[PDB]
A paper describes a structure:
HA is synthesized in an inactive form (HA0) and then processed by intracellular proteases to an active state, which consists of an apical globular head domain (HA1) responsible for mediating receptor binding and a stem domain (HA2) that harbors the fusion machinery. HA1 and HA2 are linked by a single disulfide bond and assemble as trimers of heterodimers. Stem-directed bnAbs prevent the release of viral contents into the host cell by locking HA in a prefusion state, thus inhibiting the structural rearrangement necessary to fuse to the host endosomal membrane. We recently reported on the discovery and in vivo efficacy of the VH3-30-derived bnAb 3I1427.
Numbering used by the authors:
A (entry chain B), F (entry chain B), I (entry chain B): 10 to 172
B (entry chain A): 9 to 113
C (entry chain A), H (entry chain A): 273 to 325
D (entry chain L): 3 to 9, 11 to 27, 27A, 27B, 28 to 95, 95A, 95B, 96 to 106, ...
E (entry chain H): 1 to 52, 52A, 53 to 82, 82A, 82B, 82C, 83 to 100, 100A, ...
G (entry chain A): 9 to 60
The structure:
């Protein structure tokens, strides 16, 4: 893909088509629904899960005591550093996974389409196909809904594609 | 003759920057803060039972410093010691002060 | 100061909300508190890569 | 419709599981969710997106889904979980929301099952209105299966109506109450009424009886 | 949490129409698609309709398609349902509820959240049957011990029973109603009370039947 | 793929074929061997590697001592929480990796096949190919073993595929 | 005329549920417990020298 | 009770096997013991995703 | 791919071609530049970021003191074990990510090429293409630079590919 589409407001992934009937755009429900489900599960894991701790050691001192003070400071500092490391690593990993799952859903949709147009189209390489037959808005709908039959348009597209 | 069909995703004019393994800084559509860093400035009296022992320490209320007679036989969940607290009775000291304070708390 | 509200996490700076997994207000906590970390901000992505148009 | 077995069962702390079969139109393509309906109250949401619990829900309830089969597991099942459990999912063909049949799960009731039987006669204002209804109840018993033999002066009748109440939240105690109702015509013509419990919690059927006094 | 005032329940003659409406407060109603679900007495849970957060998408069940309409007003924060040509298979409770649904039914602002906003309203009871809703008849039932109140010969079903101004709260068993050959309902409400309180503190039941303006009190004890 | 095949007992991934000679099924040794090797390496990493610890602090107390007791409880609790976090994260990561490697082996095998049938077949999109020539059980064997030559069947399949 | 050729993987009627990053609960063919939670109830006299 | 067996991990509940990396029997351990965690069960996948037929 | 190419010294990924003008080899700048950038960012994250710690507890003892000594040893040992676990896990994860990103860049380049030769070539399956027209060194340059137009050579390649 080259960039994104700012005009999409009823979904996250979609299709743009230019045929003899004009130019149109429409989003895909299933892919964006799956992405939303995964991110909501991620948030449900992270947010709202905090355990209780009531009585602990002291962590601020107004006096000079020596050994025990040194040990308590060391313990709290070690705990803090380890938990901060864990937090930074968890955030990095979860964000990488979010990016990966979104890109995977985009590629899933692209492949689902490409396999539907078996020989009636070619991959131009810019995230856009070239369909080699007269395909109207109803034909585009048959594509996206999953009802497109290649046999109907197969011979015409093979002709316009090899001669 | 032939039509074209493009596959794409959405975007937003003002994304936010986050961090991943590949990129230290990368822009996404929307993101949430996971580090609570703001507070109101006051302690909430619920759901934990709070005992604001404002001019008294826990040890003073324990022994019975006369300014602390309010805290007689009272229970609590969190005792709040103020920086204005001071003792006014007979001068004293407690060996293992911290330990008695902790066990009483 | 003691107020009249509801929060299950108390710090010497006040009560704080207990939804975010981490916090850096203070390390001294009472209740169902998020863990103290040194980071001032950790942001979690809730959307895909954003290449505008 | 979605396929849920009518009944589930177990012992306190057994991790019961309910299942839900569907079709490619709903579950194979969409996520499922699970609601809990305590007897006599509105349903409550337990699971959504096949594994997610909302704020209120304890982590004892878990969910799963694969292909056309969803599952709802309860780990630390306890006294206060006898209720109805509904599996549901969105269907794209019907373009709607399709629910499950429903599943009733029961707990292992220690078969104490001592019906505190008590026969109750009709009162004055009932008979002044030319009405009569003699009642016989059973409290704190188990399980749901039971029978009642009527004795209208040692004679059986037809069309006797009773209702079984669901389990108690703490004591897991069932209860039934059957009342026979007629007018003073067939009422003052016989004197000894009796009810005989036939239950799996005692030796043989047990009769109790009032007389016209 | 969620404060909803529901309205429209009652008795409606066969072939006529019902019109329910539940008004919600406590959240941004403006960005949550809503559902109407129904539950026939006995058992069962059937879904009726769904409406998007802007009306742009409505959908009904094949069982009630072509004779029902779901509608909403975001100004008065009101959800409403209209159904015509009612038959006995439609007498049921109707819940106005926010269920989990496809993402496009709710707004853009609530697509992603860790909360999953949800609620079911209490039931709205509608009953299709012949008219003349008659009030109740309450009789005391008196003889380890047991006593109670039997309330018979009423319709509709909406009935509630309390004990001694809501005092006796334990051991109480209110039995679910049963319908008969006639359009009459019955309801037994018993309690196991010790044999050591025949005169300690005698008990009196109260029965609230709303769709008759009825609050009947009656005391129970043997002779 | 739509689902799995419960009849496979001599492997984990395989092929099903329907030709004029009938319907048959046979598993692939190399791919399942690689998956088994990876999971066995995972188990060899995890299982049987525990280090020794003999003398430590006390972790249960029958008396009320104060400061040192508070500190020892804090230390053990912090250690326990950190190790539990590590355990949950490690299990989640290793299971994700197991799923990913199994799916990757399936896709590896699918692509290995698809590249072998260069133009003599089409991708129907349901994890099944359509081979456009009369292919007998010996021809299927030549496919799976890796000896299938497309040239032999190329012209026939191109004919039956474009005319 | 032409033959078809399918690519697939195996399965089992009774898998077990595990947890990953994508899914809180997902079903796999077989899995092993990593948390020893059962004990016999007695202390073994070997290999460490014990003094009761 | 003291028995007659062989195990390199001893807890106040008895000896336990030292193969699994974690354990939650007890936190007081002697020997080549698995680390105490709070989880009652952590399961490791030894097979692919299972979509039955 | 079968193996690597030891003769490449001006890059990491590249092309080898055999045409009527002979055999040649030349590397791709963009892909190796991206890989180098990612690994340099990884090193910039890891190397040179160490925080200061000055005064701590004692960690070696020449005397026998009992409780406090036991506690200090326990604390330091716990810290060491947790940090060692973190170090081993971080190194394993970062190396896996390095391998993954390098392989991803190779596959990115392969696909970028494959989409450029839409119908004028076939995928032999050994990380090498077969181009079905007379393609000179200037034509190979037009391929790699991104200026290759398939239309110019489309009809010739379709002829030599289907007849
Ligand atoms: C984008 O993410 C932000 C979180 O940073 C969301 O802002 C929060 O929205 C919820 C509900 O709308 C509020 O309760 C919070 O107070 C908001 N926080 C902040 C910092 O604004 C925002 O809603 C998200 N946008 C979308 C479209 O999902
Ligand atoms: C806590 O102590 C302060 C100071 O001892 C108290 O403030 C005093 O209030 C009294 C009467 O309210 C005045 O006579 C004094 O002049 C105040 N102190 C000063 C320094 O001006 C305060 O009232 C005490 N509060 C409680 C709850 O004990
Ligand atoms: C599936 O995994 C389980 C582990 O949960 C295996 O069961 C173990 O099998 C070994 C040897 O067969 C025994 O020593 C263990 O006692 C078993 N444990 C349990 C809990 O059963 C099982 O063998 C595996 N199945 C397959 C086909 O590999």
């Amino acid at each position: 893909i080259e960039n994104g589409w700012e005009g999409m407001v009823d979904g996250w992934y979609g299709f743009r088509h230019q045929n003899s009937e004009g130019r149109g755009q429409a989003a895909d429900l299933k892919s964006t629904q799956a992405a939303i489900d995964q991110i909501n599960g991620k948030l449900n894991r992270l947010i709202g899960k905090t355990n209780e701790k009531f009585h602990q050691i002291e962590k601020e001192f107004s006096e000079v005591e020596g050994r025990i003070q040194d040990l308590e400071k060391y313990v709290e500092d070690t705990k803090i550093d380890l938990w901060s490391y864990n937090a930074e690593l968890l955030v990095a990993l979860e964000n990488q996974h979010t990016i990966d799952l979104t890109d995977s859903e985009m590629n899933k949709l692209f492949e689902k389409t490409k396999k539907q147009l078996r020989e009636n189209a070619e991959d131009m390489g810019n995230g856009c196909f070239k369909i080699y037959h007269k395909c109207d808005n109803a034909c585009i709908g048959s594509i996206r809904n999953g009802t497109y039959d290649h046999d109907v348009y197969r011979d015409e597209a093979l002709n316009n594609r090899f001669q | 003759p032939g039509a074209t069909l493009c596959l794409g995703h959405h975007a937003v004019p003002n994304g936010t920057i986050v961090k991943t393994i590949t990129n230290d800084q990368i822009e996404v559509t929307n993101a949430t803060e996971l580090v609570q860093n703001s507070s109101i400035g006051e302690i909430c009296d619920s759901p934990h039972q709070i005992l604001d022992g404002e001019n008294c320490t826990l040890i003073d209320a324990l022994l019975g410093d006369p300014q602390c007679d309010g805290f007689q036989n009272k229970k609590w969940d969190l005792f709040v010691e103020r920086s204005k607290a001071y003792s006014n009775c007979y001068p004293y000291d407690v060996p293992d002060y911290a330990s008695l304070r902790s066990l009483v708390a | 100061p003691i107020g009249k509200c509801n929060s299950e996490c108390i710090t010497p700076n006040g009560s704080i909300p207990n939804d975010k997994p981490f916090q850096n207000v203070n390390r001294i906590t009472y209740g169902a508190c998020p863990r103290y970390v040194k980071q001032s901000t950790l942001k979690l992505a809730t959307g895909m890569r954003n290449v505008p148009e | 419709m979605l396929t849920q077995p009518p009944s589930a069962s177990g012992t306190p702390g057994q991790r019961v599981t309910i299942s839900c079969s569907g079709s490619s139109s709903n579950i194979g393509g969409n996520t499922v969710h699970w609601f809990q309906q305590l007897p006599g109250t509105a349903p409550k949401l337990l699971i959504y997106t096949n594994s997610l619990r909302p704020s209120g829900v304890p982590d004892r309830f878990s969910g799963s889904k694969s292909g056309t089969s969803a599952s709802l597991a309860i780990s630390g099942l306890q006294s206060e979980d006898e209720a109805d459990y509904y599996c549901a999912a969105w269907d794209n063909s019907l373009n709607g929301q399709v629910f499950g049949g429903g599943t009733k799960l029961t707990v292992l009731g220690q078969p104490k099952a001592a019906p505190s039987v008590t026969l109750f006669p009709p009162s004055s204002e009932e008979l002044q209105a030319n009405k009569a209804t003699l009642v016989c109840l059973i409290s704190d018993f188990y399980p749901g299966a039971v029978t009642v033999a009527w004795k209208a002066d040692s004679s059986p009748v037809k069309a006797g109506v009773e209702t079984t109440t669901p389990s108690k939240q703490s004591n897991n105690k069932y209860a039934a109450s059957s009342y026979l109702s007629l007018t003073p015509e067939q009422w003052k013509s016989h004197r000894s009424y009796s009810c005989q419990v036939t239950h799996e919690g005692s030796t043989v059927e047990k009769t109790v009886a009032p007389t016209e006094c | 949490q969620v404060q909803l005032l529901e309205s429209g329940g009652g008795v409606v003659q066969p072939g006529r129409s019902l019109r329910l409406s539940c008004a919600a407060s406590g959240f941004t109603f403006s960005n949550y698609g809503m559902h109407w679900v129904r539950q026939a007495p006995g058992k069962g849970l059937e879904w009726v309709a769904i409406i998007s957060f802007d009306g742009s998408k409505k959908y009904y069940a094949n069982s009630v398609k072509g004779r029902s309409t779901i509608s909403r007003d975001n100004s008065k924060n009101t959800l409403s349902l209209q159904m015509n040509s009612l038959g006995p298979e439609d007498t049921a409770l109707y819940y106005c509820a926010k269920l989990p649904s496809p993402y496009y039914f709710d707004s853009r602002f609530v697509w992603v959240a860790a909360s999953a906003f949800h609620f079911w309203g209490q039931g709205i009871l509608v009953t299709v049957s012949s008219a003349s809703t008659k009030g109740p008849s309450v009789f005391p039932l008196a003889p380890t011990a047991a006593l109670g109140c039997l309330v018979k010969d009423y319709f509709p079903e909406p009935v509630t029973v309390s004990w001694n101004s809501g005092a006796l709260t334990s051991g109480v068993h209110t039995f679910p109603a049963v319908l008969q050959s006639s359009g009459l309902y019955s309801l037994s409400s018993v309690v196991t009370v010790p044999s050591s309180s025949l005169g300690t503190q005698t008990y009196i039941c109260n029965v609230n039947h709303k769709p008759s303006n009825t609050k009947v009190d009656k005391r129970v004890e043997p002779k």
